[PDB]
């Protein structure tokens, strides 16, 4: 009766409020496991370049 079909990839968001200046890097991406490189996501609220 039902087409549930295919698959759902997973997007989550974590905002980094920048402080202290510095802050040219961010570690572990989302705390667990890894980031998925192929689609880069980072914003200054300008969404950052590829």
């Amino acid at each position: 009766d039902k087409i549930t079909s295919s698959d759902i990839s997973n997007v989550a968001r974590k905002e980094f409020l920048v402080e202290v200046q510095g802050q040219t890097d961010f570690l572990d991406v989302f705390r667990g496991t890894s980031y998925n490189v192929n689609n880069i996501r980072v914003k200054h609220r300008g969404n950052e370049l590829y």
Binding site: I8, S9, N10, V11, A12
Partner: protein, 50 residues
């Protein structure tokens, strides 16, 4: 993706008939004739759309 719930829980308290004299409230209060209706529909417990 939804990350849903990770546990949570529910519990219901009903008192019967006029002894409440009050209607069901969230998952807090329920009311009915206990011998008249077996089971529960649950909106009777607290419901959230996961």
């Amino acid at each position: 993706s939804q990350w849903r719930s990770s546990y949570t829980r529910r519990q219901i308290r009903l008192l019967d008939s006029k002894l409440t004299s009050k209607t069901s409230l969230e998952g807090s209060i329920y009311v009915t004739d206990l011998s008249t209706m077996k089971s529960i529909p649950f909106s009777a417990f607290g419901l959230i759309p996961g």
